[PDB]
Design a protein around this ligand. Structure first.
Ligand SMILES: Cc1cc2nc3c(=O)[nH]c(=O)nc-3n(C[C@H](O)[C@H](O)[C@H](O)COP(=O)(O)O)c2cc1C
Ligand SMILES: Cc1cc2nc3c(=O)[nH]c(=O)nc-3n(C[C@H](O)[C@H](O)[C@H](O)COP(=O)(O)O)c2cc1C
Ligand SMILES: O=C(O)c1[nH]c(=O)[nH]c(=O)c1CCc1cccc(Cl)c1
Ligand SMILES: O=C(O)c1[nH]c(=O)[nH]c(=O)c1CCc1cccc(Cl)c1
Lengths: 313, 313
């Protein structure tokens, strides 16, 4: 019994990977994720130029999850591209590269350069549709016309199958509109649901203070807080995008959590907060625990139950 | 050292009250809330006509919170207006009446008839804007033009101070726009943040099934899941609406949780899920717990620390 699967013309030993931004910023990080038992890895969302990010403290974790306002610190696109083209050992597992330019033109410039490497080496693109706040306009994935422009421009520039990292939605009309946008683009072959739940606020009762420095303490939430939100977004897009894969992210700490994401529709399962907190050991645990639940249920494959969450009649 | 507040021309023994929908649908429920140690109570959001609501199961609770798609079951406006006009004992505590018409005209019809009772008896209106409008459009408060129309029409029809119940927002642009809309309406004297986090999905691993019947298992989340989201919305509206009160709702299980809401800016503090699960005894516990945190810190009144959350550097 093994968890190997095939997606996007690649073979995966198991459905687990890191979530973008966690354990994936530096060469050291990417080597550590490669050496882990994860089925794949994704690089830190990048910009054309390197970024320092926001002042520290910018990430904190707690028993129920995490809050962050990192500010997109990254080593820049040239580094990640080099890692993809020269350094990654593809014999060990697939690599996804996350891009998050601050305008459409920046995304286009990056993807034009990634394309040949994607062709030659098989690196996969995850386009992050979330960015630092600009006063006066919403995040791109929350502005449907902007989203359509980004996907039109990236599709043209890139020309090859890619995926999109989505923020959570909370309204059924929004799910319908967003999915319809995504389904206009045949090159969008996977959708990753979800990014952090935006602009939460954690306060420490003893100090009477917020816990992160940027944005007056406001930052995205991950971990246990967000599992039902994540499951709902996975399932909503799984139902609406039958010609795409859905990758689940949010609130995975256990094989059971992964099992729920898969039941909701997830093909790959990404781990953020829990990986940040436990380290890359977590992947062997998650695999063991998912296999144990499959065995207790009599499931031999992921396909037997992916998307098969039951509704009440 | 005391929990007393004086706001909206009423006196409150303490800041605690039920959240709309919990322990407030029937005369029995309102009598129970009145007999409790809470500082106030709110009646179940109503429509002009009585509603049975959605099929059961439609609420479920778990260690980290709750999910619901109740479908607005209620006894109809005339019953809650009779309770306000004829049955409530205002010498025990203040009463809020929540309305949640399914169109602007239904809201207008109710408020026109509420107004004389509000003027004579002092019942306070909470208008629910985290509510459906046209199916396939977002809920009212996620549609800023609709929201503006509702507030214009209700301000004209009612002509007295009222408050609004808001869904959570997740994007700074939304906080900015929503607050700006609210600030167009001088009669909006309080803003209650937040309603449930919309369209989550809880799945039970053993049965491989969603846990509520309506909407294929999708429903609004309350409880421990949503505290940091609640705190963020309280503080965001507190900062942006300096001429209004903010009432906090979401994730209150303890005096400490309430202290965080108040630090964020809350005047009143509403209790949903935890009240549903524990019952009205919770209010003595929350009062004792909040008084003990105040004693330890040397605070004598709520105003000493309301809105006084600290930011970093
Ligand atoms: C420290 C930190 C940095 C992150 N950076 C990014 C990023 O660069 N790109 C991205 O798509 N998401 C990023 N995220 C979001 C995560 O990929 C993931 O969507 C989110 O944390 C929810 O998953 P979780 O509940 O497992 O943490 C970041 C998350 C954290 C905690
Ligand atoms: C069973 C149930 C019914 C509710 N009905 C309403 C309602 O009629 N009107 C409304 O404004 N909010 C309603 N809500 C939302 C709550 O008032 C509250 O905003 C939400 O549950 C978050 O608070 P909590 O974390 O304390 O549960 C309901 C919540 C629950 C759990
Ligand atoms: O680097 C980040 O702060 C980050 N954190 C996340 O949880 N998700 C992300 O996608 C990112 C990068 C993009 C981004 C999104 C929103 C705010 C900021 Cl400061 C940065
Ligand atoms: O009665 C409800 O489902 C409900 N539940 C909540 O958590 N908050 C609410 O504001 C309400 C009432 C509004 C509402 C929400 C969803 C469907 C319908 Cl028909 C009406």
């Amino acid at each position: 019994m093994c968890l190997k699967l095939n997606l996007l013309d690649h073979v995966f030993a198991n459905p687990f990977m890191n979530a973008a931004g966690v354990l994936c910023s530096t060469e050291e990080d990417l080597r550590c994720m490669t050496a882990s038992s994860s089925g794949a890895l994704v690089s830190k969302s990048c910009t054309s130029a390197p970024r320092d990010g926001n002042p520290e403290p910018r990430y904190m974790a707690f028993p129920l999850g995490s809050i962050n306002s990192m500010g997109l610190p990254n080593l820049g696109f040239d580094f990640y591209l080099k890692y993809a083209s020269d350094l990654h050992d593809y014999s060990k597992k697939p690599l996804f590269l996350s891009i998050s330019g601050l305008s459409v033109e920046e995304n286009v410039a990056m993807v034009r350069r990634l394309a040949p490497v994607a062709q030659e080496k098989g690196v996969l693109l995850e386009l992050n549709l979330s960015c630092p706040n600009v006063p006066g306009k919403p995040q791109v994935a929350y502005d449907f016309e902007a989203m359509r422009t980004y996907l039109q421009q990236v599709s043209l520039a890139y020309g090859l199958p890619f995926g999109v990292k989505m923020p959570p939605y909370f309204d059924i009309a929004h799910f319908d509109t967003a999915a319809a946008v995504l389904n206009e683009f045949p090159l969008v072959k996977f959708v990753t649901c979800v990014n952090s739940v935006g602009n939460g606020l954690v306060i420490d009762a003893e100090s009477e203070s917020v816990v992160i420095k940027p944005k007056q303490g406001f930052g995205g939430l991950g971990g246990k807080y967000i599992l039902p939100t994540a499951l709902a977004n996975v399932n909503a897009f799984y139902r609406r995008c039958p010609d795409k894969l859905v990758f689940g992210c949010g609130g995975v700490y256990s094989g059971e959590d992964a099992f729920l994401h898969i039941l909701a529709g997830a093909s790959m399962v990404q781990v953020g907060t829990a990986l940040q907190e436990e380290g890359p050991g977590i992947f062997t645990r998650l695999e063991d625990e998912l296999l144990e639940i499959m065995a207790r249920k009599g499931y031999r494959t992921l396909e037997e139950f992916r998307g098969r969450v039951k509704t009440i009649e």
